[PDB]
């Protein structure tokens, strides 16, 4: 839809602080911090797929809006995720060990903007079309 495409990370703010708040250790934060992944979003019927590709780590999720699914995250959390579409924003919540984090993906001019919140930390990542 508005989201379908191949997207390249161009800017990131507060990602280390976000990863620290999730409990990610030094080595994994170090491998994630300077990475510039591609995000590839596609849709087939009811099923949306989001691939994240980077030199040292790839991940993929496929889901139906409003249907909880199990996910292994790039930092190896085993989470339960639910993704909904609210006002044109794709809103993902991940739940694990009594904690939650929310990841919101929105389209703003030429940008795919991703806002990641864990407790008091808010990280913003900006992608542009490859
Ligand atoms: C939602 C998220 C936290 C942020 C975003 O979508 O931008 C997911 C993300 O970036 N995962 C990720 C990061 C690296 Cl560095 C490499 C690989 Cl494979 C995956």
Swiss-Prot record:
Nuclear localization signal (motif): residue ranges: 20-30
Modified residue annotations for Phosphoserine: 11
Modified residues (Phosphotyrosine): 18
Coiled coil: none
UniProt subcellular location: Cytoplasm; Nucleus
Nucleus in keyword set: yes
Positions annotated to bind a fatty acid: 125-127
Family classification: Belongs to the calycin superfamily. Fatty-acid binding protein (FABP) family.
Function comment: Lipid transport protein in adipocytes. Binds both long chain fatty acids and retinoic acid. Delivers long-chain fatty acids and retinoic acid to their cognate receptors in the nucleus.
Domain notes: Forms a beta-barrel structure that accommodates hydrophobic ligands in its interior.
Protein name: Fatty acid-binding protein, adipocyte
